[PDB]
Structures are given as C-alpha cells and as structure tokens.
Design an enzyme around this catalytic site. Structure first.
Site, short mmCIF file in Angstrom:
data_model
loop_
_atom_site.label_atom_id
_atom_site.label_comp_id
_atom_site.label_asym_id
_atom_site.label_seq_id
_atom_site.Cartn_x
_atom_site.Cartn_y
_atom_site.Cartn_z
N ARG A 70 -2.43 -6.59 -8.21
CA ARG A 70 -1.41 -7.64 -8.31
C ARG A 70 -1.64 -8.60 -9.46
O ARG A 70 -0.69 -9.04 -10.11
CB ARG A 70 -1.35 -8.43 -7.00
N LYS A 115 -18.67 -4.30 11.01
CA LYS A 115 -17.65 -5.29 11.36
C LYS A 115 -16.33 -4.62 11.72
O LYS A 115 -15.68 -3.97 10.90
CB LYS A 115 -17.47 -6.32 10.23
N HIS A 124 0.81 -1.21 0.00
CA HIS A 124 0.00 0.00 0.00
C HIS A 124 0.84 1.26 0.00
O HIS A 124 0.55 2.20 -0.72
CB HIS A 124 -0.91 0.05 1.22
N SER A 182 -2.97 -7.41 3.49
CA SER A 182 -3.29 -7.27 4.90
C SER A 182 -3.80 -8.59 5.47
O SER A 182 -3.37 -9.00 6.55
CB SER A 182 -4.34 -6.18 5.12
#
Ligand SMILES: N#Cc1ccc(Cl)cc1N
Ligand SMILES: N#Cc1ccc(Cl)cc1N
Ligand SMILES: N#Cc1ccc(Cl)cc1N
Ligand SMILES: N#Cc1ccc(Cl)cc1N
Ligand SMILES: N#Cc1ccc(Cl)cc1N
Ligand SMILES: N#Cc1ccc(Cl)cc1N
Lengths: 157, 157, 155, 155, 157, 157
Positions: free
Chosen positions: B90, B41, B17, B127
C-alpha cells in the site's frame, strides 16, 4: 504462456536493469524489454545503440527479446498480447510515484504491474548518475555491463 | 510451469488480499496462498477457519490453492519447486520494510519477490484495522468477503 | 587531522546552512565549504563565497572555496574523505543516500548527514528567494548581511 | 581532540554495525561504542561487549562500554557531544530525526548519520536472529566470531 | 464566519480536487477556490476555461466560489479576511513538501493549512498525469468531471 | 455552526498538542478535545488529571471544551453532532498511517479528518519521549505547558 514487459529508456542499460531482466525472465514464459523512443529528449545513445547493448547483455536469456516503443506503454503491452509490466524499485519514494502510474495503467487498460526490489549492490546505480560520474572521469565500470562501459568511454571522447 | 506463493497470516483474509490473489493467478500458471501460522500466538481464527474463508472467496480461480505453513517462507516456497513470492503493498513505508525481507529471502534461498500495488479501493483495509474497527462496532461489511464478515462478528460476540 | 567538506550551491546561504556549518566546525578540525560552480542562479560564485565568509567569521577552522566537477575530487584533492550534509526529510535521505553510496564507491569518500535544526525545517534557498520576490519577509531565515544583499538583487 | 559515540543494543553486532564503527573511527580521533543495558535479548551485555571488541581489534581508537539511562548523559560524561548512527531507509531517518533533535535540545549533543553500505541494506540483529533460528544461513552477514557464538546460543 | 481557500492551478480540475472542494465546503461557512495562474507559463487551459470547468462541476455547493490570482497565496487568503488553506494530499512525499510550504506560509503571514487525505478512488489521478495519458490516447473519462473531459480532448486535437 | 474533534491520549498534553488545539479553535466554531480512556494501558496520568491539565492549558480558548471518550472515535464525533476530526502530523510516515485511519473513518461513518503540520519548534516533542527523557532527569520544561511540567515532576518523585 505467461509474459511481461520491462520498460525504460535504458540510456545506457545498467547492471541494476540487467538484474531485473534476469529475474523477470526466470518467472515469466516471455519477457519483452521495451526501449522507449522519446522525440523530445534525445539522450546519449540512439535507440538502436541502446537495443544492441541490451541484447549483448541478455544473450543468455532466450525468452527475453528487445524492442523499441513509442507512446502509451499499455498500448505496447496489449498489442503484444500481454497485460503485465515488470519494473525495478529502489526506494519508498520510487514506490509512491510508480504506484500512481501502476494504478493508472491498471485503470485505463487492465494492465498490471509487478515490482521487484533492487539487488542491494545496485541500490545506488542509475543510468543518469552513471553518465554524470563518467563524464567527469569517475570509474563506473563495476556498475555497467562490460560492453556498455566500452561504448560509454567512446561517447565521452 | 510458472508459479508464485502469496503469503500472509490472513486473520482474516480481506478484499485487498483477494485482489492480490486474483492478479497473481492471472499472471502465473499456479498460485499457492500460504497461510503462515505462529505456533506461539493464536490469532482470531484457527488455521482451518482461515483456509475455509479463503477457499470460499477464491472458488472462481482454478489455478489457485491454499495451504498452511510455519517457519521460513522460503522453505515453503522451495519445497513446492517454486522461486517466487507475490505480495501486495500500500505505501512507501510498506515497501522499505518488505524490501528488507525480500533481499534477505533472496540472499538465503534465491527466492524472488514481486510486489503489486494495492487496488485504490482497498488502500485502507488491513486485517488488523478491520478487526479493531469491528471490535468497537464499526461497519466493515464492504471491506471483507461474504465468507468473512459474519464469521468475524461471530468471533467478536 | 580530521576534516570534512560541506557542499552546496548556497544561492544564497541560509541560516539552515549556517547551522550545519557550525555543527560541522564543532566536530572536525578542518571544514571546507564547497560552493558549486554549475554554469543559472541569483548570486555569482564570488558573491556566494563572500556571503558565507561574512556569516562564518566566528568559525576559525572553516574556509570557503569554489569548485566544479565531481565533489569527491574536490574532497580528495584537499586530502579529506568526508562530506557533511544537512537533511530535512526522509525524502531527502533517500535521494542523498544514493549519492552517498555512489561517492563512497567511486572514491572512498564518506558522507555524514545531520538533521536540520527544528526552526529551519521549512527554509531553503529556493523558497526564500521565491517568497522574497513576491514581498514576503524572510529576514528571520537568512544571515543579516545576506538579507540586505537579497533586497538589493530584487530592487 | 574529536570524538563520537556509536550507540545500540548490538544483540548481536552485525557487519552493518561494524561498517559504521570503522567509518566513525576513520573520521574521529576517539570512538566509543555504547552498548545499551535495557533490562530481554539473546546475549548478555558482557557477551555483546566481548563480541564487539573481538570484531574491532584493528581499530586502535575505538573502545566499547556499556551504559544505561539517557544516551546524552553517557556522551557528555565522557567529554564528547556527538553521536554517529547508521541509517538504512527514509523511515529510519524520520524516527531518528526526532531523537536527534530531542538530544540536541536537552544536552547540546549532535548526531551524525551515515548511510548503510549497500551490501548490508537488509541486515539487522533482529532479522539475522530470526532467520538463523529457523535454519537460514546468515554467516555472510555477521563477523565470523559472532556467527559461531550465535550457533552456540541456538544449539 | 469561518472560511478556507482551496488553491491550485486546476489545469484541469479533477475529481480528486472536486472531492476536496466538497469536503471543505461541508466544514467551513465559505470556501474560495483559488485558481493560481503563472503569468509566465500558459497551461493547457486559459484562466476563464479553468474557472468555467470548476463552476460547472460545483453548482451544487452553494457556499463555494471560484476566483483567480497570482503571487503569494497568503496574500490572496488574507485580502479576503481569511486565515486558512485547505489542500488535498495523496502520499507521505506530498506531505513533506506541503509541510514546508505550510510552515513558510504560517511564518510569513500567520495563515494555517489544513490537509485532507485523498478519497481512495482518486489516489492516482493528477492534472498532469491525466493530461499525459490523454495526450497519448488513454481513457481518462472516469477521472475528470463531465465539464472537463471532452474539453480536454478538444485541446489535444 | 461548524466544529471538530481533536482526539488523543494526551498523557500528558504537550506544547505540540496545544498548538494544534489553538489552530483548530481559530478555524471552527466549536472544538472538542477527546481524551481517550483505554482500559488496557493505564499510562502516567489519570483521565481526570489529563483533562485538568488540558483545561488549564486551554483557558483562553472559549470555544474549546475537553471530554473523555471511549471506544470508536467516529461514534464520539457523531454523538456530538459533528463530523470532523482535527489532528496534528509531524512526518510523512505519520501521514501514511493516519491516512489509512482517516479513510477508514470516512468509509465507516462519513466523518472527515483535517490534518495540520506541526509547528517547527515542536517537531520532535511527543508525550512518550517527553516522559522518557524526564524519567532520567532530562529537562523538558520548554516542551510542555507550565503546569504540566510541575505535575510531571511530582509523578516522578
Ligand atoms: N539503473 C538501474 C536500476 C534499475 C532497477 C533496479 Cl531494481 C535497480 C537499478 N539500479
Ligand atoms: N488487507 C489487505 C491488503 C493486502 C494487500 C494489498 Cl495490496 C492491499 C490490502 N488492503
Ligand atoms: N537552506 C537550508 C538548510 C540546509 C540544511 C538544513 Cl539541515 C536545513 C536547512 N534549512
Ligand atoms: N545491523 C545493522 C546495521 C546497522 C547500521 C547500518 Cl548503516 C546498516 C546495518 N545493516
Ligand atoms: N488531482 C488531484 C487530487 C487532488 C487532491 C487530492 Cl486529495 C486527490 C487528488 N487526486
Ligand atoms: N506531542 C505532540 C504533538 C502533537 C501534534 C503535533 Cl502537530 C506536534 C506535536 N509535537
């Protein structure tokens, strides 16, 4: 002053290309469209013809200019004081091949590449397929700028 | 004048990032990192923690700032007077999924998306995978900024 | 009066192609196999047509014809507006998608894709010819008649 | 007597789905839209069926039915053995290929895929619901009737 | 006892290839690098040059040897009493193409293929792209072994 | 002494898995099948049931053994003095996700991953789809080892 280069053969420029040009011109202070001269494969239109068609189609983009180029793209970009390339992508396969090129260009010259997703309407248009279809009398007028289509009908006669 | 938004959950921010942030900040006059929060969440890190970890690893980027938000990304972008999103990719699979969201975002709000190819060294960091590997004791120190790694280990312990 | 066209160079037709023909013939009243004339391959158009006719003798609603130019003109001149094409991979789909969308745009001709039978995932005319040229056994990948014909072109 | 089944959850049906239904109906004598009962969505099975029937009134050879369990049993119990499914990406093809090959293996039911219309490349039931939930305008992506019904579920 | 063949044209060998060789040599008792030559198209380097460049950059791998061949790879493999091929892959597109060749090779000769994922740092290097970039003057010194780079520049000059 | 680990949940083992096991056992001096115990999602068969089914199916592979494992796969691999993983792949999408995992595992622990392409006949079989189909009375007997199919019919009653 920000800027990017939009590279291609543009033989001829299509509405998909034009959409990319418009989007780049909206986000960078200057855009240079780089029309590649290739000594090996001489396509349908001359470089000057290709430049003229792009200039006609981009008349409303004051911060975009059109130039011919030869050889290594990252040299073209850096010679003009820039270090970004903007290109359109249609598919995941496109991304895989272009990612290799982008990583290579960043490695060798520090030049970055920004990709934009095709507008949905132009997902299937390319210069090569438009020419092929037109060669056999198919109607590609909705896929090309107005002036290109006229010029294309002349090359075919 | 020019600007872009770099969105994500950044839970936590990775070196992948940060590479995207740096490249966006090099090409746009201003960059806003948008930390998008799901009010339904909780992630691993609170919003304040996520923002702090990003700020500590972007202190050398003077034209970048960090803000949180929720709801439609295009509203976050337009309310700041901008019209561009910059996102890292990616894989080809990434591109097909992000293309659909990009075309939707352009459809509903006229906001453009520019993608950039991952740096090769971070092709495999996310992540989620960094959190999963760390949860089971794997060494992820080289994939996360200093502002993140030990805070992550702390959360897990 | 339903119908579809199955296009290709078929140089030569493989069991993968035949599987697609059979499945098209089971779902449409009329199937035309369209053999491309593209003037550099191994078999002449006539030989390719013969090989397909030989292998499709049990499909009463299928016929085989050659053609040149735009596929959509071949399809429309026969009163049809569907193409049936076999696909092996996601890469195949991305490339054929563009052709399919172009063909629909210019002529209103639709394209239906069918997934390869698992056993023929690795079979193509090109790879079969290549392998056979260097002595590899491709007899399980081609119609019995085609295989003998192929041996003849190499010897 | 040709025929195909167009399966989905259709929660709700989009213009992408409708495009596929129309193209299936143009190429097969009989089309059945199979609405999955999967017991957590926005619309009830009855509402989903109603919305599809409303949007397909101009397709005389199409009907809409609900079902549970294996799709191939739904198809075979109606005397058919073809499924027609729309695809947007190569990723879609890889996942659906596996299902298609399984369905052919266990029940001899074939699957024909059709490429999305370009204008609906980014449209899905899920994304349309998500965008509308947060106030985005999806009226150009859904049948006129569906859109009003959707506004009602959110308000 | 165990063994594998690492095939390619290696025109020239890259650091990506060398990484694959090292990883194969770490997992099999013997590795043979098969330099496959097309007798109908000369590459940039002769067979002897290709072999020399590989040997010079694999001197630290005692269980690896280098041999040339032509025709069917499975014949090269079986005539050495082996039944395994090891190949590097970068992308999903690579995998779909190599899967077809692998399944054909298993079909005709019972030879298995093991694929390994590229090292991240070499995700973008290929013999062809390195040659093209170098042809137009780009710096590829970090993508090729020392045994290759200046020999490549020599060929181009 | 060479070796590799073949990881999975194997709930239940399929003929596609068995094909991978056979191919790994043919090329490495030792193979360990690692049956993962997952405290969160308890599937259809217990770990001991899964191990038993694999042992039945691999009775002719003397250099292959079956063990349960928990947590980080690369720890399992290294604790057994190995540093290779062997896994089967069906699609390009498979390769993209598994490549991330493989690069991560190599980065954190030096453990390599070798992939093999599915046998054509099993391109469409998975544990999850076999269970789903069987749950509704579909016949998956040609996709599973003989003993698994018998055990599966019992779990369904
Ligand atoms: N031709 C062309 C073209 C170029 C770029 C994009 Cl994004 C879409 C296209 N159809
Ligand atoms: N995490 C993460 C990440 C995000 C964007 C890009 Cl381009 C690469 C990454 N590894
Ligand atoms: N040749 C060939 C071929 C053609 C179509 C399909 Cl679906 C599979 C194949 N092997
Ligand atoms: N929803 C939806 C949808 C379904 C099928 C196709 Cl081909 C395109 C779509 N947008
Ligand atoms: N060249 C080259 C190459 C070959 C294999 C792999 Cl895995 C990576 C590469 N860059
Ligand atoms: N199940 C399963 C499975 C596992 C690995 C491979 Cl290569 C193929 C499969 N069908």
């Amino acid at each position: 002053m920000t800027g990017a280069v939009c590279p291609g053969s543009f033989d001829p420029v299509t509405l998909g290309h034009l959409d990319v040009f418009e989007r780049a011109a909206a986000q960078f202070d200057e855009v240079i469209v780089a029309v590649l001269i290739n000594p090996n494969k001489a396509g349908m239109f001359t470089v000057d013809e290709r430049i003229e068609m792009i200039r006609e189609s981009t008349a409303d983009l004051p911060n975009l200019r059109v130039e011919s180029g030869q050889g290594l793209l990252v040299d073209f970009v850096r010679e003009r004081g820039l270090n970004a390339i903007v290109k359109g992508l249609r598919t995941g396969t496109d991304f895989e091949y272009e990612l290799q090129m982008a990583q290579m260009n960043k490695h060798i010259a520090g030049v970055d590449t920004f990709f934009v997703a095709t507008a949905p309407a132009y997902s299937f248009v390319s210069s090569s397929l438009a020419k092929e279809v037109a060669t056999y009398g198919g109607d590609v007028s909705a896929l090309l700028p107005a002036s290109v289509h006229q010029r294309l009908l002349g090359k075919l006669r």
